[PDB]
PDB file of C-alpha atoms and ligand atoms in Angstrom:
ATOM      1  CA  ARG V   1      -3.408 -13.726  -9.878  1.00 27.67           C
ATOM      2  CA  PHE V   2      -4.896 -10.291  -9.413  1.00 24.97           C
ATOM      3  CA  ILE V   3      -7.648  -9.298  -7.145  1.00 28.87           C
ATOM      4  CA  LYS V   4      -9.362  -5.952  -7.158  1.00 30.71           C
ATOM      5  CA  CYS V   5     -10.877  -5.305  -3.805  1.00 30.39           C
ATOM      6  CA  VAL V   6     -13.336  -2.382  -3.183  1.00 28.13           C
ATOM      7  CA  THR V   7     -14.116  -1.092   0.284  1.00 25.94           C
ATOM      8  CA  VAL V   8     -17.550   0.235   0.811  1.00 27.69           C
ATOM      9  CA  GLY V   9     -19.811   1.478   3.742  1.00 29.30           C
ATOM     10  CA  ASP V  10     -21.116   4.498   5.598  1.00 26.74           C
ATOM     11  CA  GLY V  11     -19.233   7.573   6.431  1.00 25.93           C
ATOM     12  CA  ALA V  12     -16.842   7.303   9.302  1.00 24.14           C
ATOM     13  CA  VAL V  13     -16.999   3.626   9.658  1.00 25.91           C
ATOM     14  CA  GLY V  14     -13.289   3.271   9.300  1.00 26.98           C
ATOM     15  CA  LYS V  15     -12.748   2.334   5.660  1.00 25.80           C
ATOM     16  CA  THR V  16      -9.631   4.604   4.913  1.00 28.86           C
ATOM     17  CA  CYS V  17      -8.169   3.633   8.323  1.00 28.76           C
ATOM     18  CA  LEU V  18      -8.700  -0.092   7.538  1.00 30.51           C
ATOM     19  CA  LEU V  19      -6.618   0.298   4.313  1.00 30.54           C
ATOM     20  CA  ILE V  20      -3.937   2.345   6.022  1.00 28.69           C
ATOM     21  CA  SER V  21      -3.668  -0.247   8.827  1.00 26.08           C
ATOM     22  CA  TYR V  22      -3.344  -3.132   6.499  1.00 29.13           C
ATOM     23  CA  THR V  23      -0.978  -1.584   4.050  1.00 27.37           C
ATOM     24  CA  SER V  24       1.140   0.553   6.486  1.00 34.04           C
ATOM     25  CA  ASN V  25       0.655  -0.998   9.899  1.00 33.87           C
ATOM     26  CA  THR V  26      -0.179   2.236  11.498  1.00 35.65           C
ATOM     27  CA  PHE V  27      -3.164   4.264  12.667  1.00 32.69           C
ATOM     28  CA  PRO V  28      -3.411   8.056  12.164  1.00 34.87           C
ATOM     29  CA  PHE V  29      -3.105   0.750  -1.367  1.00 36.52           C
ATOM     30  CA  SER V  30      -1.771  -2.520  -2.715  1.00 34.08           C
ATOM     31  CA  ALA V  31      -0.300  -5.665  -1.346  1.00 34.53           C
ATOM     32  CA  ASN V  32       1.417  -8.706  -2.697  1.00 32.04           C
ATOM     33  CA  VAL V  33       0.932 -12.143  -1.130  1.00 34.62           C
ATOM     34  CA  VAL V  34       2.006 -15.636  -1.978  1.00 36.47           C
ATOM     35  CA  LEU V  35      -4.152  -7.230  -4.442  1.00 35.80           C
ATOM     36  CA  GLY V  36      -5.368  -3.769  -5.468  1.00 36.29           C
ATOM     37  CA  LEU V  37      -7.266  -1.973  -2.825  1.00 36.34           C
ATOM     38  CA  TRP V  38      -9.808   0.658  -3.701  1.00 38.78           C
ATOM     39  CA  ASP V  39     -11.220   3.246  -1.163  1.00 34.87           C
ATOM     40  CA  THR V  40     -14.609   4.799  -1.707  1.00 33.69           C
ATOM     41  CA  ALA V  41     -16.699   7.722  -0.294  1.00 31.28           C
ATOM     42  CA  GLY V  42     -19.844   6.345   1.335  1.00 32.21           C
ATOM     43  CA  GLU V  43     -25.208  10.237  -0.113  1.00 31.49           C
ATOM     44  CA  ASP V  44     -23.450  13.036  -2.073  1.00 29.07           C
ATOM     45  CA  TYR V  45     -21.565  10.349  -3.876  1.00 29.78           C
ATOM     46  CA  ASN V  46     -24.460   8.180  -4.751  1.00 28.13           C
ATOM     47  CA  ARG V  47     -23.800   8.556  -8.513  1.00 27.03           C
ATOM     48  CA  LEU V  48     -20.045   8.706  -8.548  1.00 28.15           C
ATOM     49  CA  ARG V  49     -19.123   6.085  -5.987  1.00 29.56           C
ATOM     50  CA  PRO V  50     -20.426   3.159  -8.142  1.00 32.21           C
ATOM     51  CA  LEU V  51     -18.117   4.083 -10.855  1.00 32.08           C
ATOM     52  CA  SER V  52     -15.308   2.535  -8.703  1.00 30.99           C
ATOM     53  CA  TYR V  53     -16.793  -0.909  -8.802  1.00 32.92           C
ATOM     54  CA  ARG V  54     -16.008  -1.963 -12.384  1.00 31.19           C
ATOM     55  CA  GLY V  55     -14.038  -5.219 -12.521  1.00 31.46           C
ATOM     56  CA  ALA V  56     -14.121  -5.741  -8.773  1.00 29.95           C
ATOM     57  CA  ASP V  57     -13.388  -9.308  -7.608  1.00 29.18           C
ATOM     58  CA  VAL V  58     -14.571  -8.755  -4.034  1.00 27.35           C
ATOM     59  CA  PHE V  59     -16.171  -6.110  -1.884  1.00 25.74           C
ATOM     60  CA  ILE V  60     -15.279  -5.286   1.705  1.00 26.95           C
ATOM     61  CA  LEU V  61     -18.607  -4.062   3.124  1.00 27.10           C
ATOM     62  CA  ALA V  62     -17.742  -2.282   6.363  1.00 27.81           C
ATOM     63  CA  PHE V  63     -20.157  -1.121   9.183  1.00 29.51           C
ATOM     64  CA  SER V  64     -19.174   0.161  12.606  1.00 31.60           C
ATOM     65  CA  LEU V  65     -19.577  -2.105  15.661  1.00 28.37           C
ATOM     66  CA  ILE V  66     -20.459   0.958  17.690  1.00 28.19           C
ATOM     67  CA  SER V  67     -23.230   2.175  15.382  1.00 30.92           C
ATOM     68  CA  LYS V  68     -26.681   0.513  15.101  1.00 33.61           C
ATOM     69  CA  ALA V  69     -27.404   2.811  12.245  1.00 34.09           C
ATOM     70  CA  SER V  70     -24.454   1.711  10.013  1.00 35.88           C
ATOM     71  CA  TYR V  71     -25.608  -1.901  10.880  1.00 39.90           C
ATOM     72  CA  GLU V  72     -29.137  -1.197   9.676  1.00 42.34           C
ATOM     73  CA  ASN V  73     -27.866   0.524   6.614  1.00 46.63           C
ATOM     74  CA  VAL V  74     -26.034  -2.594   5.282  1.00 44.85           C
ATOM     75  CA  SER V  75     -29.350  -4.180   4.366  1.00 46.57           C
ATOM     76  CA  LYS V  76     -31.161  -0.809   3.769  1.00 47.04           C
ATOM     77  CA  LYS V  77     -28.532   0.753   1.379  1.00 46.65           C
ATOM     78  CA  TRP V  78     -25.411  -1.244   0.623  1.00 44.53           C
ATOM     79  CA  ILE V  79     -26.790  -4.609  -0.433  1.00 45.12           C
ATOM     80  CA  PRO V  80     -29.343  -3.036  -2.851  1.00 41.13           C
ATOM     81  CA  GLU V  81     -26.517  -0.936  -4.257  1.00 41.25           C
ATOM     82  CA  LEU V  82     -24.004  -3.731  -4.822  1.00 46.54           C
ATOM     83  CA  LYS V  83     -26.687  -5.987  -6.317  1.00 46.79           C
ATOM     84  CA  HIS V  84     -27.521  -3.281  -8.821  1.00 44.14           C
ATOM     85  CA  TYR V  85     -24.018  -2.579  -9.980  1.00 44.68           C
ATOM     86  CA  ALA V  86     -22.174  -5.827  -9.287  1.00 45.06           C
ATOM     87  CA  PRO V  87     -24.397  -8.816  -8.571  1.00 44.05           C
ATOM     88  CA  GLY V  88     -22.486 -12.002  -7.916  1.00 43.27           C
ATOM     89  CA  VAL V  89     -19.243 -10.497  -6.699  1.00 42.89           C
ATOM     90  CA  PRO V  90     -18.535 -11.859  -3.201  1.00 43.86           C
ATOM     91  CA  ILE V  91     -18.824  -9.694  -0.055  1.00 42.77           C
ATOM     92  CA  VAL V  92     -16.673  -9.803   3.030  1.00 40.16           C
ATOM     93  CA  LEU V  93     -18.629  -8.215   5.779  1.00 39.16           C
ATOM     94  CA  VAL V  94     -16.505  -6.303   8.299  1.00 39.49           C
ATOM     95  CA  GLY V  95     -17.516  -4.817  11.607  1.00 38.88           C
ATOM     96  CA  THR V  96     -15.056  -2.070  12.308  1.00 40.47           C
ATOM     97  CA  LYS V  97     -14.024  -0.378  15.690  1.00 42.53           C
ATOM     98  CA  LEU V  98     -13.690  -3.588  17.661  1.00 43.36           C
ATOM     99  CA  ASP V  99     -11.527  -1.756  20.246  1.00 44.70           C
ATOM    100  CA  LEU V 100     -14.543   0.508  21.083  1.00 46.15           C
ATOM    101  CA  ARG V 101     -16.875  -2.371  21.439  1.00 47.24           C
ATOM    102  CA  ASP V 102     -14.552  -3.952  24.038  1.00 48.59           C
ATOM    103  CA  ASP V 103     -14.480  -0.824  26.104  1.00 51.20           C
ATOM    104  CA  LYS V 104     -17.266  -0.211  28.625  1.00 54.16           C
ATOM    105  CA  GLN V 105     -15.953   3.264  29.090  1.00 56.70           C
ATOM    106  CA  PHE V 106     -16.600   4.136  25.537  1.00 56.49           C
ATOM    107  CA  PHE V 107     -20.328   3.706  25.917  1.00 53.34           C
ATOM    108  CA  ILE V 108     -20.359   5.660  29.147  1.00 57.93           C
ATOM    109  CA  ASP V 109     -18.592   8.473  27.270  1.00 58.41           C
ATOM    110  CA  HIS V 110     -20.862   8.256  24.353  1.00 54.99           C
ATOM    111  CA  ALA V 111     -23.502   4.569  20.815  1.00 55.71           C
ATOM    112  CA  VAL V 112     -25.179   1.151  20.607  1.00 56.01           C
ATOM    113  CA  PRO V 113     -22.935  -1.993  20.285  1.00 56.77           C
ATOM    114  CA  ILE V 114     -23.300  -4.779  17.841  1.00 61.21           C
ATOM    115  CA  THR V 115     -22.536  -8.252  19.161  1.00 59.02           C
ATOM    116  CA  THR V 116     -20.598 -10.913  17.385  1.00 59.70           C
ATOM    117  CA  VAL V 117     -23.699 -13.072  17.120  1.00 56.90           C
ATOM    118  CA  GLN V 118     -25.626 -10.206  15.481  1.00 60.59           C
ATOM    119  CA  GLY V 119     -22.830  -9.551  12.975  1.00 59.22           C
ATOM    120  CA  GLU V 120     -22.890 -13.179  12.081  1.00 59.78           C
ATOM    121  CA  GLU V 121     -26.704 -13.195  11.583  1.00 62.55           C
ATOM    122  CA  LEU V 122     -26.157 -10.204   9.263  1.00 60.76           C
ATOM    123  CA  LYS V 123     -23.539 -12.144   7.363  1.00 59.94           C
ATOM    124  CA  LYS V 124     -25.957 -14.950   6.773  1.00 55.84           C
ATOM    125  CA  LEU V 125     -28.801 -12.586   5.811  1.00 59.16           C
ATOM    126  CA  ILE V 126     -26.792 -10.988   2.946  1.00 57.62           C
ATOM    127  CA  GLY V 127     -25.076 -14.175   1.856  1.00 58.92           C
ATOM    128  CA  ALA V 128     -21.546 -13.004   2.632  1.00 58.75           C
ATOM    129  CA  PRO V 129     -19.005 -15.894   2.768  1.00 58.69           C
ATOM    130  CA  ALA V 130     -17.077 -14.083   5.535  1.00 56.46           C
ATOM    131  CA  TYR V 131     -17.669 -11.747   8.588  1.00 55.92           C
ATOM    132  CA  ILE V 132     -14.661 -10.379  10.417  1.00 53.83           C
ATOM    133  CA  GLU V 133     -14.641  -7.968  13.398  1.00 55.11           C
ATOM    134  CA  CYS V 134     -11.624  -5.732  13.502  1.00 54.55           C
ATOM    135  CA  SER V 135      -9.949  -2.654  14.778  1.00 55.57           C
ATOM    136  CA  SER V 136      -7.576  -0.322  12.723  1.00 56.51           C
ATOM    137  CA  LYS V 137      -6.637   1.214  16.074  1.00 56.03           C
ATOM    138  CA  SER V 138      -5.292  -1.922  17.697  1.00 56.60           C
ATOM    139  CA  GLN V 139      -4.794  -3.650  14.255  1.00 57.32           C
ATOM    140  CA  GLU V 140      -6.593  -6.732  15.589  1.00 58.49           C
ATOM    141  CA  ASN V 141      -7.820  -8.980  12.771  1.00 55.87           C
ATOM    142  CA  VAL V 142      -6.987  -6.423  10.142  1.00 58.14           C
ATOM    143  CA  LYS V 143      -4.717  -8.946   8.393  1.00 56.89           C
ATOM    144  CA  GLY V 144      -7.712 -11.402   8.737  1.00 56.73           C
ATOM    145  CA  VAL V 145      -9.937  -9.089   6.693  1.00 59.77           C
ATOM    146  CA  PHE V 146      -7.872  -9.221   3.699  1.00 58.17           C
ATOM    147  CA  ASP V 147      -6.840 -12.877   4.126  1.00 60.44           C
ATOM    148  CA  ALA V 148     -10.637 -13.635   3.953  1.00 63.27           C
ATOM    149  CA  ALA V 149     -10.864 -11.488   0.893  1.00 59.01           C
ATOM    150  CA  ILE V 150      -8.199 -13.441  -1.007  1.00 55.42           C
ATOM    151  CA  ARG V 151      -9.478 -16.871   0.248  1.00 57.20           C
ATOM    152  CA  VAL V 152     -13.044 -16.022  -1.051  1.00 58.28           C
ATOM    153  CA  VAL V 153     -11.886 -15.172  -4.595  1.00 59.13           C
ATOM    154  CA  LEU V 154      -8.962 -17.564  -5.232  1.00 57.77           C
ATOM    155  CA  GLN V 155      -9.817 -21.083  -6.408  1.00 55.85           C
ATOM    156  CA  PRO V 156     -10.855 -23.336  -4.853  1.00 59.22           C
TER     157      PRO V 156
HETATM  158  N1  LIG P 201     -11.293   3.672  17.957  1.00 62.17           N
HETATM  159  C1  LIG P 201     -11.233   3.601  16.606  1.00 62.17           C
HETATM  160  N2  LIG P 201     -11.427   4.663  15.787  1.00 62.17           N
HETATM  161  C2  LIG P 201     -11.437   4.421  14.392  1.00 62.17           C
HETATM  162  C3  LIG P 201     -11.123   3.056  13.826  1.00 62.17           C
HETATM  163  N3  LIG P 201     -11.160   3.127  12.587  1.00 62.17           N
HETATM  164  C4  LIG P 201     -11.308   4.443  12.355  1.00 62.17           C
HETATM  165  N4  LIG P 201     -11.452   5.185  13.408  1.00 62.17           N
HETATM  166  C5  LIG P 201     -11.814   6.660  13.575  1.00 62.17           C
HETATM  167  O1  LIG P 201     -13.051   6.840  12.851  1.00 62.17           O
HETATM  168  C6  LIG P 201     -12.922   7.957  12.209  1.00 62.17           C
HETATM  169  C7  LIG P 201     -13.221   7.766  10.635  1.00 62.17           C
HETATM  170  O2  LIG P 201     -12.234   6.970  10.050  1.00 62.17           O
HETATM  171  P1  LIG P 201     -12.020   6.914   8.494  1.00 62.17           P
HETATM  172  O3  LIG P 201     -11.155   5.883   8.218  1.00 62.17           O
HETATM  173  O4  LIG P 201     -11.612   8.301   7.979  1.00 62.17           O
HETATM  174  O5  LIG P 201     -13.510   6.445   8.061  1.00 62.17           O
HETATM  175  P2  LIG P 201     -14.200   6.441   6.511  1.00 62.17           P
HETATM  176  O6  LIG P 201     -14.978   7.626   6.365  1.00 62.17           O
HETATM  177  O7  LIG P 201     -14.963   5.236   6.472  1.00 62.17           O
HETATM  178  O8  LIG P 201     -13.161   6.351   5.568  1.00 62.17           O
HETATM  179  C8  LIG P 201     -11.638   8.552  12.358  1.00 62.17           C
HETATM  180  O9  LIG P 201     -11.827   9.533  13.478  1.00 62.17           O
HETATM  181  C9  LIG P 201     -10.900   7.475  12.856  1.00 62.17           C
HETATM  182  O10 LIG P 201      -9.770   7.726  13.634  1.00 62.17           O
HETATM  183  C10 LIG P 201     -10.903   1.991  14.864  1.00 62.17           C
HETATM  184  O11 LIG P 201     -10.665   0.854  14.558  1.00 62.17           O
HETATM  185  N5  LIG P 201     -10.994   2.342  16.103  1.00 62.17           N
HETATM  186 MG1  LIG P 202     -12.386   7.457   4.033  1.00 64.27          MG
END
């Protein structure tokens, strides 16, 4: 009846904002439904970050929908890391910053978008049971992230 969830992913992808959005319903860590949420720092921390993983029931592996590099780093860095420290714990893959992907003006001002179908193909590649695209800014699908997280750990 407890669920430790650890959020991981590159710098600036939106991990802390994701937790603030879910828990506080605002945009600048625990919940009860009928869930402990851990934040991490995503290279200086290579040795210390993994310490947070012990007894994790699920990982939220975030990458940014506006950043091809964070997309590439899921397979390059994060998967190898989680498999070393916590093989077998399920992964919910989250593409953050959905509000920016929607906005043509963002790419004029700035960035390479990741499509829903490409996020889905990455999901399959890493064996994640879930892939959710979300925006902490608009809050869209943020509740969905954590609802996936609980569904994927709880029996059935
Ligand atoms: N537009 C937009 N900006 C975001 C979103 N999530 C985070 N940010 C911005 O991205 C930056 C990094 O967010 P932060 O949560 O601190 O990322 P973290 O390093 O992964 O923890 C901040 O400038 C945020 O305001 C989002 O959904 N939409
Ligand atoms: Mg943070």
